[PDB]
Each structure stands twice: as structure tokens, then as C-alpha cells.
DNA sequence: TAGCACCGCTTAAACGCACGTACGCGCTGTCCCCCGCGTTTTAACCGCCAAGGGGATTACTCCCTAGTCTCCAGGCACGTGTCAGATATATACATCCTGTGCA
DNA sequence: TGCACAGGATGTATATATCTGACACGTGCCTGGAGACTAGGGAGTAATCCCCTTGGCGGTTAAAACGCGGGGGACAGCGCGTACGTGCGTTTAAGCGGTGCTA
């Protein structure tokens, strides 16, 4: 809630939130992050390493196309 | 005096009249064929029944009488055609199907 | 599996038997005699 | 007043499994899913008609749309159920 | 409000990755994860806030969040849709 | 009336730090397969020989269809009552204390 | 002298009951179906004109295929060094419910 409050306050003055909105934002964040993490896991596996590394996430993003 | 709903005439539980009104209000076309709302009601009822059956099977196998989002996620992710249908959809508090890559396990 | 209610049922079961007569003595041997006849412990014990 | 499919979902569920209960969260999930898939089919129908330049959305258009959206086996079952509904309506 | 990018902590990233089944992790992962989360949140929040401001509004409702996510193609069920 | 703010106990999730160990990287030799290249084989078009078939576009002509206003009377939604469950606390002894009469 | 038990003390798993959630049954309003009017978009009808294969055929060509050398790319081993895993003691502020305002 602190992070979302800060980001919204940076984006727009004097905003308010619904509690349900903040909860939905948390749920969506967790879903996206778990998807990203599993993609990173598959990437690291392909590298033949168990230690996931930032490049694995970057690759996941590129193949997904969030930064291509 | 007495009358019977168009849903009963079609033999559908979903409110075909409400579907017809929602279609009309959605302004999707200037003219709406009377067969469109019934057809929509039928397909929607079939999909609802299928998903509900899957959820109920999940509930029974979990041995819990009340469907919670976990059960819905299990059902949706299991049925591969629905899984591919809804791949961009996330279910609140649904969680994920357990999955471990073989090479991560020490053995067996 | 055994309780004082089992003792009460035995007291009710006492009505069938009629012959035996009591006596008195005290020693630690008699204390152990009471102890075996008051085990109330199962084969698991 | 506000109206939702929740009651109809509850009805169909009870038809499927009498002894089974359902949470409000799952009820809302199902209501949102049916609303979404209705919207999807309606948009597909609209787009098709627009290309065909047909002013009337008939059951036939919705049928083809349903084949488009749904996987082949699910599409076949959907079309079969819709046609059965049409036949019962014809009575 | 300050430094809240740190507020996510390492252990939260740990638990989330644990859900992802990762057996082995690297220290650098946390910063990258935070950056990714930051840009994701920024985009979702901007979309939601513009959805709100349309309606001559001041409170971001769950409808604004869910429809903003729908516009990003991420579809979310169970919050009154 | 749902969000905001301050109170103020209660943990427990974060954190610093300690030890190690198994994992990632650097470098090894191996060997097999896939590039650079040359020779043979196949697919494709030109011109032969000029079309008929049938398909998509276009228009006219009803007529049927559900867009429209309207009444009838309802069945569906909003709410309260009832029934159940999870929580709460007496009890019938349970697990024992302890003066003192007995061996 | 030390033991046996007569007389008495905290407790508690067992048992009886009180403190919270969810579903079904009652009201009652924005309705959904129905009756009749309506017309112009859909559908049935009829060209009509244009684009699609005929069909295999030889004489060619450009691309495909096949063969070969080899050399360097992939990759299985592994020495080793460390930076994440597991396990403490310790702190914070995340969670809980509560009181007062309001936008």
C-alpha cells in the first residue's frame, strides 16, 4: 500500500483509493510476478544453471516482448 | 392471463430476455434477430454448466463442499482446451497448479 | 476404556453372585493385591 | 436495483450437484466469466456483421462466432446445444 | 513516503519466487525484480488513474483497476465484474 | 458510508551474522557434425494451342421481421429470520497435597 | 522410625452451553411477455462479364539436392572459490481491534 500510494501521489495529486482497488492491485502484481518468475526459472534451466540471474529475467522479458 | 417465459420455452435457465435487452442496449446492431438471444442463452448455459461441473469435481476430490477460488483455478487450468482459452486470465486467489522441473529434484 | 461407571456396572453385576464373604488384613502385599485388581490399563500400556 | 446472473448460476449449480455449496467469491467469479464471454461473443458477431454489411445479427452469425471463439470440440458442443435450443423454440 | 521500493524487502521476493518453484536464487535478482514491479505498477496505475479522471472522480475504484488491466490485456476475475 | 487518521498491544517477519558446501566459472581435451564448395538432378516457365465454366458482382421485388408504444402482472432482487457452527466454560472427577494414626 | 491413609487441594479432559455466519423465506417494483402497428433490410430472383484451369508437352534454366573435407563448436570433466542456503539472537512495524471525523 505504501508503494502504490507513493506511485499514485507522484502521478496525481490528492488521489484516493478504494481498499478493494488496492487489494486487486496486489493480486494482479503477485500474479504477474509469479508468471515472470516461472519464465525466469525455465530460462535458467535452459542455461543449465540452478541459480537464476538477472539476464534470465531480461531474456524472459524479451521473449515475452515487454522490452523487445 | 397465464404466460411462460421465453427461457422455459427454449428450455434454458439463464434469462434470455435479459440477454436480449443487454444485446439491444449494447447497440451492436440496428436489428437483432430473435434467434440471437436464445442462441446466446444456450451457449452461455452450456459453458456455465461445464465450468461448474469441473469445479464440483475439484471440490469432491478436495473433499470440500464449498467452491473457493482454488477449486476454480484447478478446474480451469486442468482442462487443457479451457486452459488455452483463458491463458491471459488470472483468477483471484486461485493460485497455481503444483509443478516441479525434474532436473531440480535430487533424484526420483 | 474403563471408568468408575464400569465399576458401577460390576456392582450391578454383583447381584448375580451371592456366596463370597469378606475379611480384613493389611500389609504392603495386600496393597499390591489391591493394585493389580485396580489396574485399569490396556494391552497397549 | 442491481441484477446479476448469480441467481441463475446458483440454480444451475444446484441442478448439477445438490449437496454442494458455493462461496460468494466463486459466485462473483462465475458471474464475471459469463458476462465477459457474452461480451466477447457479441463483439465477434458485431465485427462479422460489419464486414458482411448485414444489419441483423441472426442466430447463424452468433453460431459462426461461437465456432470462432471456442476450441473446436467446445465449439461443436456449444453449437449443438444452441441448435437444440433453436429446435425447442421452433415448437 | 520514501525508499518504499526497498519496502518490498528481500523475503517477499523470496516467498514469491518460492511459489515459482525456484530452487536457487541470486542476490542481484531482488533489484531487477523491484525494477520490473516498479514499471508494471507505474503503467497499471497510470491507466487506472486516467480511467478514474474521466468520470469527474477522486477515488480510484476497483472497476478502474480491473478495466485498466483489461486494457493491458491482463484479465482479472472475481472483483465484481 | 467508506476512507482516513491516530492509539497502542502482539507478535513474527526482517534483519545481522555466523558457518560451509555445493554450485558456477575457467580451463581442459575430444570428436562429430554442419559450413564452404563441386557436381547432378528436379521444378518451373515459354510457347504450343484459345478456349468454356462457373463464379462474384449487381440489381429489382416483395414481405416479413422485430423497432415501436403500450398494458398486464410478475419474478426477481433486497432484506429479515431462522438454523448451524465455531467458540466458550462448568464438571465429575483428575492429578495430587498433607497431617497422623498404624506397623 | 518410617509407613499407610484419613482428610483435604488445586486443576482439566470431559462435557454442557454461549457467542458469530450463512442460507431460505417474505415483500414489493421496475420490470419481461405479450398485442398490435409498422417498413425497409433481408432474402429470393437474374443476369453478366471476367477470371480461372485446359492438360501434357520439349526445350530449356535457376534452385534443390546430394557428396565430400575438415576444423572448430559443442560438451562432458573437473579444480576451486566463493556467495547463497540453514540456523540462530534480536528488532520492527505489520496486524489486530478500537474512536473520532468526513468528503
Swiss-Prot record, chain A:
GO terms (BP aspect): nucleosome assembly
Section covered of the full-length record: 69 to 136 of 136
Modified residues (N6-succinyllysine): 12
Description of post-translational modifications: Phosphorylated by the catalytic component of the Dbf4-dependent kinase (DDK) complex Cdc7. Acetylation is generally linked to gene activation.
Protein name (database record): Histone H3
GO cellular component, one term: chromatin
Modification N6-methyllysine occurs at: 12
Subunit: The nucleosome is a histone octamer containing two molecules each of H2A, H2B, H3 and H4 assembled in one H3-H4 heterotetramer and two H2A-H2B heterodimers. The octamer wraps approximately 147 bp of DNA. Interacts with Nasp.
Residues with PTM N6,N6-dimethyllysine: 12
Curated annotation (Swiss-Prot), chain C:
Organism domain of life: Eukaryota
Subcellular location per the Swiss-Prot or TrEMBL entry: Nucleus
Assembly and interaction partners: Belongs to the SWR1 complex at least composed of ACT1, ARP4, RVB1, RVB2, ARP6, YAF9, VPS71, VPS72, SWC3, SWC4, SWC5, SWR1 and HTZ1.
Function: Participates in the catalytic exchange of histone H2A for the H2A variant HZT1, an euchromatin-specific factor, leading to chromatin remodeling and changes in transcription of targeted genes. Indirectly involved in vacuolar protein sorting.
The name this protein goes by in its record: Vacuolar protein sorting-associated protein 71
Organism: Saccharomyces cerevisiae (strain ATCC 204508 / S288c) (Baker's yeast)
Lineage of the species this protein comes from: Eukaryota, Fungi, Dikarya, Ascomycota, Saccharomycotina
Gene: VPS71
Amino acid at each position: 500500500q505504501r508503494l502504490v500510494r507513493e506511485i499514485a501521489q507522484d502521478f496525481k495529486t490528492d488521489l484516493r483509493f478504494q481498499s478493494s482497488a488496492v487489494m486487486a492491485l496486489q493480486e494482479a502484481s503477485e500474479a504477474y510476478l509469479v508468471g515472470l518468475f516461472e519464465d525466469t526459472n525455465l530460462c535458467a534451466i535452459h542455461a543449465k544453471r540452478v541459480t537464476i540471474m538477472p539476464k534470465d529475467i531480461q531474456l524472459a522479458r524479451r521473449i515475452r516482448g515487454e522490452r523487445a | 392471463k397465464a404466460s411462460q417465459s421465453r427461457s422455459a420455452k427454449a428450455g434454458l435457465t439463464f434469462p434470455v430476455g435479459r440477454v436480449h435487452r443487454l444485446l439491444r442496449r449494447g447497440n451492436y446492431a440496428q436489428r437483432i434477430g430473435s434467434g440471437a438471444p436464445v442462441y446466446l442463452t444456450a451457449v452461455l448455459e452450456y459453458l456455465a454448466a461445464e465450468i461448474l461441473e469441473l469445479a464440483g469435481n475439484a471440490a469432491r476430490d478436495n473433499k470440500k463442499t464449498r467452491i473457493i477460488p482454488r477449486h476454480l483455478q484447478l478446474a480451469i487450468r486442468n482442462d487443457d482446451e479451457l486452459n488455452k482459452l483463458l491463458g491471459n486470465v488470472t483468477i483471484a486467489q486461485g493460485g497455481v497448479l503444483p509443478n516441479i522441473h525434474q532436473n531440480l529434484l535430487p533424484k526420483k | 476404556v474403563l471408568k468408575p461407571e464400569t465399576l458401577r456396572e460390576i456392582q450391578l453385576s454383583y447381584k448375580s453372585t451371592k456366596l463370597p464373604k469378606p475379611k480384613r488384613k493389611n500389609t504392603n502385599r495386600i496393597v499390591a493385591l489391591k493394585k493389580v485388581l485396580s489396574s485399569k490399563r490396556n494391552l497397549h500400556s | 436495483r442491481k441484477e446479476t446472473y448469480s441467481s441463475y448460476i446458483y440454480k444451475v449449480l444446484k441442478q448439477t450437484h445438490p449437496d454442494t455449496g458455493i462461496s460468494q467469491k466463486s459466485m462473483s467469479i462465475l458471474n464475471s466469466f459469463v458476462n465477459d464471454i457474452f461480451e466477447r461473443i457479441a463483439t465477434e458477431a458485431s465485427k462479422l456483421a460489419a464486414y458482411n454489411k448485414k444489419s441483423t445479427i441472426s442466430a447463424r452469425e452468433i453460431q459462426t462466432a461461437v465456432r470462432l471463439i471456442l476450441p473446436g470440440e467446445l465449439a461443436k458442443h456449444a453449437v449443438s446445444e444452441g441448435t437444440r435450443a433453436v429446435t425447442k423454440y421452433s415448437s | 513516503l520514501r525508499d518504499n521500493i526497498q519496502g518490498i524487502t528481500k523475503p517477499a521476493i523470496r516467498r514469491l519466487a518460492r511459489r515459482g518453484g525456484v530452487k536457487r536464487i541470486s542476490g542481484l535478482i531482488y533489484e531487477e525484480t523491484r525494477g520490473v514491479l516498479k514499471v508494471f505498477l507505474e503503467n497499471v496505475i497510470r491507466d487506472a488513474v486516467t480511467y478514474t479522471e474521466h468520470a469527474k472522480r477522486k477515488t480510484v475504484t476497483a472497476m478502474d483497476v480491473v478495466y485498466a488491466l483489461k486494457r493491458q490485456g491482463r484479465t482479472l476475475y472475481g472483483f465484481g465484474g
